[PDB]
């Protein structure tokens, strides 16, 4: 069992890992504001009493 | 194994090594009956 000598053996195998990344909280804040602006502009916002 | 070495070796079940591994049909972490 070695690379090129057996099916299922890999030289550079895929490994389990964490796919999460990091982003600036300021960027997240600005993105939330932009999303609200976009919903207002595209008319996808409705306000309800309760 | 020949008679002289057999006369000095001991049987496998004379110790506790048999119960210190989890090898089983399902793998290496056997959960015994009754947990």
């Amino acid at each position: 069992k070695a690379p090129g000598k057996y099916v299922g053996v890999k030289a550079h195998p895929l490994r389990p890992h964490d796919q999460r990344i990091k982003i600036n909280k300021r960027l997240l804040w600005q993105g939330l504001k932009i999303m609200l602006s976009a919903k207002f502009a595209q008319g996808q916002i409705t306000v309800v009493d309760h | 194994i020949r008679p002289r070495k057999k006369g000095m070796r001991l049987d496998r079940r004379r110790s506790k090594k048999q119960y210190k591994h989890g090898r089983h049909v399902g793998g290496w972490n056997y959960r015994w009956l009754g947990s």
Binding site: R15, D18 | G27
Partner: peptide, 25 residues
């Protein structure tokens, strides 16, 4: 006979390597 894989050990080792690798200084 079949070559059954020890997933417990393999995945534990992979996690250990991942954590060390991503915490190196």
């Amino acid at each position: 006979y079949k070559p059954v894989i020890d997933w417990v050990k393999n995945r534990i080792n992979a996690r250990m390597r991942q954590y060390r690798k991503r915490s190196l200084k």
